Ligand binder design. Structure first.
Ligand SMILES: CCCCCCCCCCCCCCCCCC(=O)O
Ligand SMILES: CCCCCCCCCCCCCCCCCC(=O)O
Ligand SMILES: CCCCCCCCCCCCCC(=O)O
Ligand SMILES: CCCCCCCCCCCCCC(=O)O
Ligand SMILES: *[C@@H]1O[C@H](CO)[C@@H](O)[C@H](O)[C@H]1NC(C)=O
Ligand SMILES: *[C@@H]1O[C@H](CO)[C@@H](O)[C@H](O)[C@H]1NC(C)=O
Lengths: 45, 293, 240, 249, 292, 292, 240, 249, 45
């Protein structure tokens, strides 16, 4: 029985940390290329 | 008067203390090798530095400083509150508390503000006093009561001017007040002793200044002309002490004509002349006359 | 008055307590949130980006030269080009990597690593290298014959200039402590040695010494644990 | 499922042909876009001089030497005095634009070397100074180093990017290598990145454009010594608002 | 009702990537090992395609590496001494709000270029001897433009509009929630530009990198006193960054910082990696080999 | 149930006016720029009708400029010294309740002519050295007509009907909710009249502007003591105006106040605007012009 | 006793905390609320009311004369009548405005402004003025040719005696800080200059110098943020 | 969709014709109304002498000069000794009423000047005094300045409205300009504003009626020097309760 | 989950500030005139 993530103030920024939206999108840093290269393929053919 | 420059980069005045009362001692320059400014990196003079703990301004900071023993939280230097280092035209550092301002008059915020750009702004409106504050604010006024909020330590006005980071331009709630005669392109001087400066003195004198200062003490016998500062290193730019009634040259000073310690004149009416070429502008001069009745 | 009893932990300030606090500004609406490119929501996404391993962290080597693995034409066979430990948080080549610096903000790490070696010689420079990952328990292999008994890749220089050597997650524990040295060599990851499988062969009028650039990163199964304070920059006085 | 080595980049009246290209880095997977109505704050109608400003401007050619440290440009500053882009950047207070940075360095199959072409958002240039007072000039970079213009600025300490950050982690930024055995060009398409929808093209430089030799240019006697590095950049989706008198700096 | 929301409030475990079982591959045209790092893309090579892997149903939690968990930790952002003894009988101090004065918080923030966040500021105040006598303090937030106090009695402490916290030293640390206060969409730890137009030809060039979108005013602290208390109070400000939005990750700082508002490293550049004897020397002794 | 009410308790963002896209207008009879300020009406000219505007979906929150948010902030309304040392061995003080003694609260209130509000009064009491020793105080509200105490032991402190708060200095600041106490519908910061009939020919004329509808009695504070404590206690009263209803907005005061209950400015009138050199001089340097 | 744990912020008195407090008067019903004309519920409604800009804030000019922009018959063409910065919270002409005083109770402002110029000359006085708003980055225009490159209105004197110049919200940031000067000139709004488009032409026996009254206000998209304490009146002693 | 320059105001047996009128300011958008049963507190039946008191009373004519500072009246006080309104205001303790203030100032098309006609609720008149003790007479205005009667009172410091508030913000009050090139009259219809439903017409002055020259009256030699300013006001919805002996002040 | 705007006392004036009724009616101060003047129209015709 969990009783947390409760805001006691009318201002939304007084709430606790937003710790329920873990999203991992590494492609914008790891594969930031136009031509999607398959793993099994030689990249520069 | 021991300092005749805005930043104190003329002080050789034997004060080995951050403040005359309630301060810290200064570390000797011949012993501060842990730091950039010492007698090893500056062998021969080079900023009044030597074998002494005296406050100096070799780096062109806003006020004479000195290395202190690094103990508190890494503070290894402190500005020196030298009360005799006030520029002869510097009226002091005063507090600015609110809307009744120290100098009631016109204001100007300039991201290029210097001490002279503030004085020149106030002098162009016939204001006696020019007050720099926060490094960018310039206040003018004829108020004889600019001290209405009390004086302040000179170190409290050590914010760099936004146009010249070697000059003090007040601080948060602190206003540094100058007499707008400083750096004027001439003027009448009828007084016993006054330190007449080069045109636009805290800055470098402009190219093309032909200025005439009238120094007539009505009743004096001899005028003791001394030059505590003559950074006039050039050829065409010359400082002449023209006579009065006759308007005849009495002493011509330039680069290789540096003036004696006292070029006294027997005339009670002298005309300090200044010339400036179109190139090679220097820091200027700061003459000091003393009338002997 | 509603009956309450204060428990231990009352009045304490835990620096990692996700709790509420009164807002200083009633009715404050912040500046609208416009889209800014390049938002990262996970530090693991940063650890998967390949960054240059400082494999030439040797005395005398200065600047960008510390990022190059020198490869030259060998007069003998089965020689060692370079070696480096694959402990991400250990003082060594992995310090220069984003994974090796984000690892130091955590106590325990897990998952496969990845070192992409890029050959930066002439197009005419050909060669085959044996890049071997030696799992823990063994020192650096003294011969290529001993290194090829571990996880290795025989890299052939060619049109594709880069090879990837995955350091597989070969560990007894689910996590390895980022701290190394002493009894914490229990968490040693291993040693990666680069051997000359064949020579570095070049035609005439061609440079005989080239460079391999190592690019270390983390695999998709990489994971960090127990956020701590890094030991990379020290401070003796408040920055004024 | 591969990247074709041949590529043609046609923007405006400019066209760039490359026959040895690695790929095209789309910075952070985001194409340059015009400022949406939701993200905009300025009310004036922006000018979008599509083909007059969005085009490839070949700006600088730097001779790669064996001991070369690298070069960096600041994207708005490098085009602020060039073409109709510069005029719009001077006449308008507000500006936003992506770019298509194309670095070109060709060498024979007997040359070797590797450049790191990276586009660094908010590339604040550091000064390398001894321990000195905040009064010291060496603590802060002069304007020639912060805004190098179109000529760029030779790196003093490429190992720390002249920013105190390790060059080895500069690959966290949108980057591409020019490995002379592999490719002769590096293309980076960078969208407008800023905490503001528009910003002054004169005051603020959104991105730095670093070209650092990681593997030094080595060749044998008889090879062509002069191996140039050319920077051709193209604004993409350039908007300008706040028309006024043209301001240089 | 809304009891379903209170049920799904505990942090759920997001696990790492499972490893699939892989067999040997003997053929042509399939080269998952060969990459092209010039493309600027990290290698897409997987462990399954380079070695024979097993099936590992990975249950390692990746949830702690989030930007929220990495940043939602109260670190020291300011030490404000309320000097009221000796030569400094002020009893008040106006502190420029800057979070870049201490290395641990500064280096974590500079991982990102832009950060938009709310903060939980905590004030841990005490005397020099660590004691906390009941002494009323006033922590007034002075936003940019609000008049800064010039004494312990000045009118600005009336805080009719300024946020102010009155708390004795004996009280638990005052803690308040600060919103995202910035004219920009996000704070900017790196501002490649100048705040004002002009020539920027000064010998010092102090204005490079100074974005006023980050300058969020001052924290004015005073002892609520009528005269000098003879005691210096050390207020340590701790900022916990919550509701974090980070953009444009950057290399973590490698050189030691020298100043607060400028990247400025020594001429003695420290290598990111520690030096070793040779490129072929590793200091891992391992075990005794069976047959050398 | 009523859980729907607790859900819609956070402040919703009301945004500013969006700007519509506008094109050029070339015709006659349509003059949105030409106005007639003589009519006493502000200009109805919109940005779209004077320049070519874009579509700006404005998301700036206007919610903070409400009268509630502008006024619901505890400001200093009174400083009451409970003198119990030296020549004043009283141990008590009866303070006339007036919210016009301090400039910050007074100027905000005088923005409106009539204000009807409840208040949250807070008492921040301490000694001269800012310390708060456990010392029992009694804050008794003495409404108009109730007998005021004349000593620290007098019978009025029995507070059988008067509201009274007993709190030690060591306690957190006493805070109470005060209703709208006034015979009128609203308080009246400006009363153009006299409280009593008569001739009003006195040389001083102290009764002009004095509306007893605002005079809400006294705050009697005492140390609950049997003799002199030798310690002076400074009680700072902070009023947070809630449930605000403001009427007839007024010009904000420009001259410095001189007295509490009267508008009275010096003969040296201060200009609302600071003086500049000329009507054609602006101190904004801008950048270097491309071609002068 | 219900188990509770006191958190930081306990016992603090935040002056901007909208919380409950015990009522001193049980069962108090206040005086009934009758309708009073002129209720204002938003300070933005007050900022949209046009109030006189003190454009003639010059030395020597005293009293109501500081509210007049003098306009006279010019002997030369393309001359400057008056200029003023449009920073609402800056010490200058906007101090005399309700918008410029309510802005000072806030840290950041946003939205278009509005200056309605009213010509108070004779009916026989004719003239055309160019009122230009110069967006930031430029100093005050030195010529009308330079000023007409910005947002401007050519005002023709006539039966309608007033013109409105909207200062459009031309800003890089969503909000501008009310504080100006120093590095806060980053938030400069611009400069409004009044130029003689044509001359100020009058028939004989007619006054040759008239006055323009500037009336500054805020547009409908105006917005304030971060309530603070103004710096307009200072106090050194409790008003007794 | 415009305001007609011609206007006729018929109240009681009084009628006011204007041919150059800007508009009619309805103060705060509220017409004068009789006190509702919900807002009333006094139990006596009020007297509503509709046409005998609700009518235009031309009360004062002030000569506008070049150096004139302005004039102010207090609305109940200006009618307390005039007509049947004054008698009801004296015989009755309680009074409430709106008004239709009509200021008239006509001048030739060769005159110039601008008046600010504003109706200020609760116009507390300030005294201008040096720093003095609260005993000092100069700190508080005499009765001639607080209740000027029908003659009005010449402003001493119109820049601060003789109230410490800037005249420039007096436009926050229901106002109208008399710009001599535009209009010759200013009409303000003000409803009864008070924290009380009724109030004493003798003690309390609900509104001030300021007429301040912002642009000074300038003309050439030969023009009519005497340019008067006439104040015609009309009570609207006047109620009176609490009948007793007639009380003057 | 918001838990605020709760009155703990029988007197309604002990409640927190009424911060949920932002109303903007500037016409009573900006256009307090009888004849509504269109924006596009010349006011005094
Ligand atoms: C009552 C006391 C309240 C405390 C108010 C604290 C306000 C803090 C501002 C928010 C901190 C983040 C922004 C810091 C950015 C400055 C760093 C820099 O760029 O130099
Ligand atoms: C137990 C202690 C309770 C405190 C009681 C406080 C009562 C305060 C009265 C309400 C304040 C607002 C009305 C002030 C009006 C006076 C100003 C004036 O017109 O001079
Ligand atoms: C005060 C009562 C609060 C009740 C909050 C909801 C808790 C639900 C209990 C089940 C916990 C959720 C996970 C699960 O389904 O097992
Ligand atoms: C103790 C339980 C109190 C529950 C209060 C109601 C909260 C409802 C949760 C949803 C928040 C409202 C806004 C929304 O619909 O997203
Ligand atoms: C300062 O110098 C003088 C030189 O005579 C010496 O007597 C004095 O002791 C010095 N003081 C300090 C603090 O070094
Ligand atoms: C520096 O000079 C002073 C003065 O002669 C001398 O007393 C001192 O010993 C010197 N210190 C060093 C380190 O030379």
């Amino acid at each position: 029985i969990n009783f947390t993530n409760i805001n006691y103030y009318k201002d939304s920024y007084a709430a606790s940390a937003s710790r329920q939206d873990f999203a991992q999108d590494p492609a914008k840093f790891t594969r930031p290329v136009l031509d999607a290269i398959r793993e099994a393929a030689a990249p520069l053919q | 008067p021991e300092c005749f420059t805005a930043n104190g980069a003329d002080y050789r005045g034997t004060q080995n203390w951050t403040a005359l009362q309630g301060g810290k001692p200064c570390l000797f320059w011949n012993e501060t090798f842990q730091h950039p400014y010492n007698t090893l990196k500056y062998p021969n003079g080079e900023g009044g530095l030597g074998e002494h703990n005296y406050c100096r301004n070799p780096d062109g900071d806003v006020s004479p400083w000195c290395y202190v023993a690094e103990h508190e939280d890494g503070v290894y230097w402190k500005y020196c509150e030298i009360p005799a280092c006030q520029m002869p035209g510097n009226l002091g550092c005063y507090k600015d508390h609110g809307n009744p301002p120290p100098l009631t008059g016109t204001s100007k915020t300039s991201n290029k503000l210097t001490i002279q750009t503030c004085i020149s702004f106030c002098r162009s409106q016939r204001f006696k006093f020019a007050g720099m504050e926060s490094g960018y604010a310039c206040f003018c006024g004829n108020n004889p009561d600019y001290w209405k909020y009390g004086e302040a330590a000179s170190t409290e006005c050590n914010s760099v001017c936004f146009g010249d980071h070697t000059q003090p331009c007040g601080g948060d709630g602190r206003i540094i007040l100058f007499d707008t005669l400083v750096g004027a392109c001439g003027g009448n001087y009828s007084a016993m002793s006054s330190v007449v400066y080069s045109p636009d003195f805290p800055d470098t004198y402009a190219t093309g200044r032909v200025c005439y200062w009238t120094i007539r003490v009505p009743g004096a016998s001899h005028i003791h002309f001394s030059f505590p500062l003559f950074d006039i290193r050039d050829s065409a730019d010359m400082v002449e002490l023209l006579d009065g009634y006759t308007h005849r040259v009495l002493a011509r000073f330039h680069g290789r004509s540096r003036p004696p310690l006292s070029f006294n004149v027997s005339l009670d009416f002298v005309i300090l002349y200044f010339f400036s070429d179109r190139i090679n502008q220097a820091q200027g001069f700061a003459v000091l006359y003393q009338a002997v009745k | 008055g509603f009956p309450t009893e204060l428990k231990p932990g009352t009045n304490q300030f835990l620096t990692t307590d996700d709790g509420t606090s009164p807002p200083i500004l009633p009715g404050f609406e912040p500046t609208p949130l416009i889209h800014i490119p390049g938002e990262f929501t996970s530090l693991l996404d940063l650890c998967q980006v390949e960054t240059i391993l400082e494999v030439n962290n040797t005395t005398g080597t200065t600047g960008v030269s510390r990022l190059l693995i020198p490869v030259r034409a060998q007069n003998n066979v089965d020689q060692l080009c370079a070696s480096f430990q694959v402990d991400p948080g250990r003082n060594g080549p992995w310090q220069s990597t984003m994974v090796g610096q984000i690892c130091r903000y955590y106590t325990q790490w897990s998952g496969s690593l990845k070192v992409t070696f890029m050959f930066t010689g002439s197009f005419m420079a050909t060669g085959k290298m044996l890049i071997a990952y030696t799992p823990p328990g063994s020192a650096q292999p003294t011969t290529r014959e001993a290194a090829m008994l571990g996880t290795h890749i025989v890299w052939d220089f060619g049109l594709q200039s880069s090879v990837t050597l995955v350091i597989p997650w070969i560990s007894n524990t689910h996590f390895r402590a980022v701290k190394t040295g002493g009894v914490y060599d229990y968490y040693a990851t291993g040693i990666v040695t680069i051997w000359y499988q064949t020579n570095f062969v070049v035609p005439p009028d061609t440079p005989t010494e080239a460079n391999i650039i190592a690019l270390g990163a983390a695999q998709k199964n990489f994971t960090l644990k127990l956020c701590k304070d890094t030991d990379e920059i020290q401070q003796t006085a408040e920055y004024q | 499922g591969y990247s074709d080595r041949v590529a043609q980049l046609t923007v405006g009246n400019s066209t760039i042909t490359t026959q040895e290209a690695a790929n095209i880095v789309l910075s952070y997977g985001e194409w340059p876009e015009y400022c949406p109505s939701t993200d905009a704050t300025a009310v004036d109608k922006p000018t979008r001089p599509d083909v007059s400003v969005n085009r490839f401007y070949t700006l600088s050619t730097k001779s790669w030497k064996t001991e070369s440290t690298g070069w960096y440009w600041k994207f708005p500053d490098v085009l602020n005095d060039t073409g109709v882009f510069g005029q719009n950047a001077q006449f308008h207070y507000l500006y936003r634009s992506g770019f298509c940075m194309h670095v070109q360095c060709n060498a024979s199959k007997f040359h070797q070397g590797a450049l790191l072409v990276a586009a660094i958002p908010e590339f604040v240039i550091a000064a390398s100074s001894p321990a000195t007072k905040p009064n010291s000039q060496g603590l802060y970079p002069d304007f020639a180093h912060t805004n190098p213009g179109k000529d760029g600025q030779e790196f003093r300490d490429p190992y720390v990017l002249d920013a105190g950050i390790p060059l080895s982690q500069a690959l966290i930024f949108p980057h591409q290598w020019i490995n002379l055995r592999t490719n002769n060009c590096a293309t980076i398409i960078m969208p407008y990145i800023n905490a503001l929808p528009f910003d002054s093209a004169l005051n603020h430089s959104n991105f730095g454009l670093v070209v650092i030799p990681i593997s030094p240019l080595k060749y044998c006697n008889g090879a062509t010594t002069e191996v140039p590095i050319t920077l051709t950049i193209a604004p993409l989706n350039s908007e300008f608002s706040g028309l006024r008198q043209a301001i240089k700096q | 009702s809304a009891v379903s929301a209170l049920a799904d409030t505990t942090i759920s475990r997001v696990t790492a990537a499972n490893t699939a079982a892989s067999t040997h591959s003997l053929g042509t045209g399939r080269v998952p090992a060969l990459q092209a790092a010039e493309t600027g893309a990290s290698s897409n090579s997987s462990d399954e395609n380079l070695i024979e892997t097993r099936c590992v149903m990975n249950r390692n939690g990746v949830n702690e590496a989030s930007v929220e968990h990495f940043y939602s930790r109260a670190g020291l952002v300011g030490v404000v001494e309320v000097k009221d003894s000796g030569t400094s009988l002020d009893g008040y101090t106006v502190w420029p709000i800057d979070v870049m004065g201490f290395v641990q918080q500064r280096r974590k923030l500079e991982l990102s270029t832009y950060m938009r966040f709310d903060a939980e500021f905590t004030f841990v105040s005490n005397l020099n001897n660590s004691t906390t006598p009941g002494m009323l303090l006033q922590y007034m937030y002075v936003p940019p433009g609000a008049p800064k106090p010039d004494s312990r009695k000045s009118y600005q402490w009336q805080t009719a509009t300024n946020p102010s916290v009155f708390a004795k030293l004996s009280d638990p640390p005052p803690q308040v929630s600060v919103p995202f206060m910035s004219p920009a969409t996000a704070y900017q730890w790196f501002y490649d530009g100048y705040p004002t137009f002009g020539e920027h030809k000064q010998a010092t060039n102090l204005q490079y990198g100074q974005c006023p979108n980050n300058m969020m005013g001052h924290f004015a602290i005073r002892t609520v006193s009528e005269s000098t208390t003879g005691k210096n109070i050390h207020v340590r400000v701790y900022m916990r960054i919550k509701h974090v939005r980070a953009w444009v990750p950057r290399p973590l700082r490698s050189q030691a910082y020298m100043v607060k508002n400028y990247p400025t490293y020594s001429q003695t550049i420290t290598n990111t990696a520690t030096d070793r004897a040779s490129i072929t020397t590793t200091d891992y002794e391992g075990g005794v080999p069976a047959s050398p």
